[PDB]
Design an enzyme around this catalytic site. Structure first.
Site, PDB file in Angstrom:
ATOM      1  N   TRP A   1       0.802  -1.214   0.000  1.00  0.00           N
ATOM      2  CA  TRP A   1       0.000   0.000   0.000  1.00  0.00           C
ATOM      3  C   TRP A   1       0.839   1.270   0.000  1.00  0.00           C
ATOM      4  O   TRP A   1       0.338   2.324  -0.393  1.00  0.00           O
ATOM      5  CB  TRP A   1      -0.949  -0.022   1.199  1.00  0.00           C
ATOM      6  CG  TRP A   1      -1.812  -1.266   1.241  1.00  0.00           C
ATOM      7  CD1 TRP A   1      -1.681  -2.321   2.095  1.00  0.00           C
ATOM      8  CD2 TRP A   1      -2.931  -1.583   0.382  1.00  0.00           C
ATOM      9  NE1 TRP A   1      -2.645  -3.268   1.830  1.00  0.00           N
ATOM     10  CE2 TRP A   1      -3.423  -2.841   0.784  1.00  0.00           C
ATOM     11  CE3 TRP A   1      -3.566  -0.918  -0.674  1.00  0.00           C
ATOM     12  CZ2 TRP A   1      -4.530  -3.449   0.164  1.00  0.00           C
ATOM     13  CZ3 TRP A   1      -4.669  -1.528  -1.293  1.00  0.00           C
ATOM     14  CH2 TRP A   1      -5.136  -2.775  -0.869  1.00  0.00           C
TER      15      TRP A   1
ATOM     16  N   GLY B   1      -7.246   5.131   1.719  1.00  0.00           N
ATOM     17  CA  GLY B   1      -6.075   5.323   2.537  1.00  0.00           C
ATOM     18  C   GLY B   1      -6.277   6.322   3.661  1.00  0.00           C
ATOM     19  O   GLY B   1      -5.318   6.981   4.089  1.00  0.00           O
ATOM     20  N   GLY B   2      -7.509   6.435   4.162  1.00  0.00           N
ATOM     21  CA  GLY B   2      -7.779   7.299   5.297  1.00  0.00           C
ATOM     22  C   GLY B   2      -7.524   8.772   5.046  1.00  0.00           C
ATOM     23  O   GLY B   2      -7.276   9.510   5.994  1.00  0.00           O
TER      24      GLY B   2
ATOM     25  N   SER C   1     -12.613   2.644   0.549  1.00  0.00           N
ATOM     26  CA  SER C   1     -12.203   3.286   1.808  1.00  0.00           C
ATOM     27  C   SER C   1     -12.394   4.798   1.680  1.00  0.00           C
ATOM     28  O   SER C   1     -13.490   5.249   1.300  1.00  0.00           O
ATOM     29  CB  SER C   1     -10.788   2.814   2.114  1.00  0.00           C
ATOM     30  OG  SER C   1     -10.512   2.889   3.492  1.00  0.00           O
TER      31      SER C   1
ATOM     32  N   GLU D   1     -13.369  -6.128   7.884  1.00  0.00           N
ATOM     33  CA  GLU D   1     -12.833  -4.773   7.751  1.00  0.00           C
ATOM     34  C   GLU D   1     -12.008  -4.340   8.954  1.00  0.00           C
ATOM     35  O   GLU D   1     -11.077  -3.531   8.810  1.00  0.00           O
ATOM     36  CB  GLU D   1     -13.973  -3.776   7.589  1.00  0.00           C
ATOM     37  CG  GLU D   1     -14.933  -4.162   6.542  1.00  0.00           C
ATOM     38  CD  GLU D   1     -14.528  -3.553   5.242  1.00  0.00           C
ATOM     39  OE1 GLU D   1     -13.353  -3.134   5.143  1.00  0.00           O
ATOM     40  OE2 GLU D   1     -15.360  -3.522   4.320  1.00  0.00           O
TER      41      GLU D   1
ATOM     42  N   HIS E   1      -9.897  -5.495   5.157  1.00  0.00           N
ATOM     43  CA  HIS E   1      -9.983  -4.196   4.505  1.00  0.00           C
ATOM     44  C   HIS E   1      -9.017  -4.117   3.329  1.00  0.00           C
ATOM     45  O   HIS E   1      -7.803  -4.296   3.500  1.00  0.00           O
ATOM     46  CB  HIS E   1      -9.648  -3.106   5.523  1.00  0.00           C
ATOM     47  CG  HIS E   1      -9.980  -1.723   5.059  1.00  0.00           C
ATOM     48  ND1 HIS E   1     -11.279  -1.289   4.876  1.00  0.00           N
ATOM     49  CD2 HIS E   1      -9.187  -0.669   4.753  1.00  0.00           C
ATOM     50  CE1 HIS E   1     -11.270  -0.029   4.479  1.00  0.00           C
ATOM     51  NE2 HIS E   1     -10.014   0.374   4.400  1.00  0.00           N
TER      52      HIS E   1
END
Ligand SMILES: *[C@@H]1O[C@H](CO[C@@H]2O[C@@H](C)[C@@H](O)[C@@H](O)[C@@H]2O)[C@@H](O[C@@H]2O[C@H](CO)[C@@H](O)[C@H](O)[C@H]2NC(C)=O)[C@H](O)[C@H]1NC(C)=O
Ligand SMILES: *[C@@H]1O[C@H](CO[C@@H]2O[C@@H](C)[C@@H](O)[C@@H](O)[C@@H]2O)[C@@H](O[C@@H]2O[C@H](CO)[C@@H](O)[C@H](O)[C@H]2NC(C)=O)[C@H](O)[C@H]1NC(C)=O
Ligand SMILES: *[C@@H]1O[C@H](CO[C@@H]2O[C@@H](C)[C@@H](O)[C@@H](O)[C@@H]2O)[C@@H](O)[C@H](O)[C@H]1NC(C)=O
Ligand SMILES: *[C@@H]1O[C@H](CO[C@@H]2O[C@@H](C)[C@@H](O)[C@@H](O)[C@@H]2O)[C@@H](O)[C@H](O)[C@H]1NC(C)=O
Ligand SMILES: [O-]/[N+](=C\c1ccc2cccc(O)c2n1)Cc1ccccc1
Ligand SMILES: [O-]/[N+](=C\c1ccc2cccc(O)c2n1)Cc1ccccc1
Ligand SMILES: *[C@@H]1O[C@H](CO)[C@@H](O)[C@H](O)[C@H]1NC(C)=O
Ligand SMILES: *[C@@H]1O[C@H](CO)[C@@H](O)[C@H](O)[C@H]1NC(C)=O
Ligand SMILES: [Cl-]
Ligand SMILES: [Cl-]
Ligand SMILES: [Cl-]
EC number: 3.1.1.8
Length: 526
Positions: A79, A113-114, A195, A322, A435
């Site tokens: 990621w 990715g928040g 996300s 998740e 997730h």
């Protein structure tokens, strides 16, 4: 090989996919680089170029902190960005089928990715397979993340907030102005994202300025009503000021503060972002979307409640586990390198980690709802409970509630429950269907027989890729030829959803019904 866009000519490159050909345009700029006096401002329109821009390699990723918790581990490192970080990062990619389609439905991916990490160049976001297999055009874009993309002094144009959302919006605009030159139908554009990407999609459904830039929407593991997805104007100011103090940039002129943060090097801003909050969690989104009064004219939960969104079809879903990934970024007794059996005591400490500013009663109420066991002697009781708590509160219940509320205004909704664990999943089995690990299936990576997936996974991916593409093209995510389970509409009464797995595709009702009543009706009072 060379396409004329409205700002200049761009040269692409040819790819061999499955004995066919895909034309990839990687790294097309879509905005003036947000540098110098442009940092923190909304993206500015691009000045034309006269050469042939060589769009043959992914561009810089946007500045972002990197996950360094598990060095050398593909499970986390897949990621992390795979191109140089730079503030010069507002670029996008286009994969078009060969031969050049005539009026192809367009899929636009927005990565998650928040709101702090991510990049369109990730291996699992490669649109070449969707272009090859389904003859859609796939577009993806980099957008600013973190404070560089969401720092907010609401009202203040030097830092209005939501710059990362306007980045995405400007890219949708580029597709409206330019994709017909690539053989795409600008009238058949489906946003999809995972996300924070999926939260972004849900916010584009709410933002009037994006309503004419897309047709349909797909939300994977994410929606704006997720507790991590919108920063309040209180927090957003308290966090902006803290960043100013941590960088010695406190001023009284709110504009002079920004001017001071503009002379700071990107690394110093990045280094300080984690500390603008007194008590973070693994789910902390310290700089994210805010009610700016431009992209977002009101608090989004009110707009959703009162039907103030683009009327269209949505495809929404979540994964079985998740929550599990976040448990090894700070929960006690947990580790990716053992079965993470935890005690009741460790469970309660874990809640203090994930719910730090929540009262003692609230935390007890979470405990009460999740610790009525079918068997009190099962040792993974508490480990599984904490994963579900984090999963149900942060992803599954907000997405179900978004789908109920959105479908109540007449539009067709489709909900899926992804429960297949990738045979190549590098995280341990106790973490389950994590997730982000439906993405490879959506992008058709298991269609590559050379990459160690089972045949069952190739069939699952191939069906998912069809349902997605049919949804984008026709607003109906069916597989109509291979005696497939029909995917029923989600309605607020019956609440039917489709399970996605390699064994049997099933229709079930009322996902996580007991858990979500706790999270959506009781827990918001505490
Ligand atoms: C709003 O901001 C204040 C200030 O945050 C502190 O200073 C920042 C520069 C940064 O380093 C943060 O991590 C700091 O916590 C917060 O006030 C602090 O709150 C904690 C506990 O709540 C307390 O122990 C500190 O002494 C406080 N410091 C000051 C200067 O007041 C405050 O909690 C923030 N959040 C809210 C909701 O108000
Ligand atoms: C699972 O591992 C965690 C994490 O501990 C670390 O990782 C391990 C794989 C191993 O390399 C340890 O030496 C590492 O410290 C364990 O959590 C630790 O537990 C011990 C004793 O309970 C405690 O002293 C530490 O503070 C814990 N570390 C934490 C909470 O971060 C956990 O006990 C292991 N559980 C099982 C069932 O094996
Ligand atoms: C852009 O690319 C032009 C053509 O490049 C040709 O094809 C690529 C894939 C390479 O294999 C290269 O060796 C070939 O020449 C160049 O002629 C041109 O200089 C490039 N422009 C810039 C600004 O670099
Ligand atoms: C391309 O198609 C345009 C109409 O789009 C239609 O509606 C959207 C919602 C999609 O479902 C798409 O499949 C449909 O075809 C035409 O107006 C336009 O002229 C066409 N352009 C071509 C054929 O070059
Ligand atoms: O949260 N962090 C990592 C994280 C979160 C969720 C995941 C889900 C699946 C797989 C993963 O590897 C995941 N990794 C740490 C981190 C946070 C913010 C900035 C930088 C780093
Ligand atoms: O860091 N990653 C994810 C991440 C980090 C922090 C978050 C905070 C709040 C909510 C979130 O969803 C967060 N997600 C890597 C990653 C990206 C895409 C898919 C899987 C994994
Ligand atoms: C200082 O603040 C005023 C408004 O309070 C603003 O008009 C001015 O532009 C700021 N200073 C500078 C140098 O911009
Ligand atoms: C349908 O079945 C055939 C084999 O009979 C397979 O090759 C094809 O990929 C399947 N199509 C979809 C969309 O799953
Ligand atoms: Cl389950
Ligand atoms: Cl029922
Ligand atoms: Cl209840």
């Amino acid at each position: 090989i060379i396409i004329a866009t409205k700002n200049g000519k761009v040269r692409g490159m040819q790819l061999t996919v499955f004995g066919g050909t895909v034309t990839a345009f990687l790294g097309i700029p879509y905005a003036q680089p947000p540098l110098g006096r442009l940092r923190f401002k909304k993206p500015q329109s691009l000045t034309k170029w006269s050469d042939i821009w060589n769009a043959t390699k992914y561009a810089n990723s946007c500045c972002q902190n990197i996950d360094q918790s598990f060095p050398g581990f593909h499970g986390s490192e897949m990621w992390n960005p795979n191109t140089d970080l730079s503030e010069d990062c507002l670029y996008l990619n286009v994969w078009i089928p060969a031969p050049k389609p005539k009026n192809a439905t367009v899929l636009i991916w927005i990565y998650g990715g928040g709101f702090q990490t991510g990049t369109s160049s990730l291996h699992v976001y490669d649109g070449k397979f969707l272009a090859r297999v389904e003859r859609v055009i796939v577009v993806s874009m980099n957008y600013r993340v973190g404070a560089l993309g969401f720092l907010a002094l609401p009202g203040n144009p030097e830092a209005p907030g939501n710059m990362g959302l306007f980045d995405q919006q400007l890219a949708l605009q580029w597709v409206q102005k330019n994709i017909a030159a690539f053989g795409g139908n600008p009238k058949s554009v489906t946003l999809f994202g995972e996300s924070a990407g999926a939260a972004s999609v849900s916010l584009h459904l709410l933002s009037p300025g994006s309503h004419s830039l897309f047709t349909r929407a797909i939300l994977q593991s994410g929606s704006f009503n997720a507790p991590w997805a919108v920063t309040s104007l209180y927090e957003a100011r308290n966090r902006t000021l803290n960043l100013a103090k941590l960088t010695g940039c406190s001023r009284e002129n709110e504009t002079e503060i920004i001017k001071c943060l503009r002379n700071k090097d990107p690394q110093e801003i990045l280094l300080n972002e984690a500390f603008v909050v007194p008590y973070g969690t693994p789910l902390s989104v310290n700089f994210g979307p805010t009610v700016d009064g431009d992209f977002l004219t009101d608090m989004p939960d009110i707009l959703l409640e009162l039907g103030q969104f683009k009327k269209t079809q949505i495809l929404v879903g979540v994964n079985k586990d998740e929550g599990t990934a976040f448990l090894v970024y700070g929960a006690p007794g947990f580790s990716k390198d053992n079965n993470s059996i935890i005690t009741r005591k460790e469970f309660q400490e874990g809640l203090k980690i994930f719910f730090p500013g929540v009262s003692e009663f609230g935390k007890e109420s979470i405990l009460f709802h999740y610790t009525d066991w079918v068997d009190d002697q099962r040792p993974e009781n508490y480990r599984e409970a904490l994963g579900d708590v984090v999963g149900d509160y942060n992803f599954i219940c907000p997405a179900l509630e978004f789908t109920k509320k959105f479908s109540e205004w007449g539009n067709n909704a489709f909900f899926y429950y992804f429960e297949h664990r990738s045979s190549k999943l590098p995280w341990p089995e106790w973490m389950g269907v994590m997730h982000g690990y439906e993405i490879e299936f959506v992008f058709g990576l298991p269609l590559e027989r050379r990459d160690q997936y089972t045949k069952a996974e190739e069939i699952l991916s191939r069906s998912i890729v069809k349902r997605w593409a049919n949804f984008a093209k026709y607003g109906n995510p069916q597989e109509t030829q291979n005696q497939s389970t029909s995917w029923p509409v989600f309605k607020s009464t019956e609440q039917k959803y489709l399970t996605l797995n390699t064994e049997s595709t099933r229709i079930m009702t009322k996902l996580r019904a007991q858990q979500c009543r706790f999270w959506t009706s009781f827990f918001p009072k505490v």
